[PDB]
């Protein structure tokens, strides 16, 4: 989801 990208580590 969008939030999975947001929270993910770089």
């Amino acid at each position, epitope marked *: 989801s*969008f*939030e999975d*990208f*947001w929270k993910g*580590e*770089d």
Partner: nanobody
Amino acid sequence: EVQLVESGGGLVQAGESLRLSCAASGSTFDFKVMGWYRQPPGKQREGVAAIRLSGNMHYAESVKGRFAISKANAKNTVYLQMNSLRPEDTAVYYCKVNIRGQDYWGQGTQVTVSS
């Protein structure tokens, strides 16, 4: 005590382009990720685009290809290019940044697209 300053918004004609700007402020520390969410009137808030410090970026499906997010040369500053704007793009646009493990949200700036 990070402060977000959003600029560039306003009331625009369908089919025109608009660039939003967001500068995260009050930190010497680079963000991990930074981006934009938007809230159409009466609807839930949804992510629009995000970019990580590496330059890796992510677009929601509803805007993918139509919007473009990028890092400004300035510390903790990103741009949203909004091209070919349509009335369905009308929304409060919110900047958000994650710095040292904490999320911070801007107050939001209106983008309104007449038909």
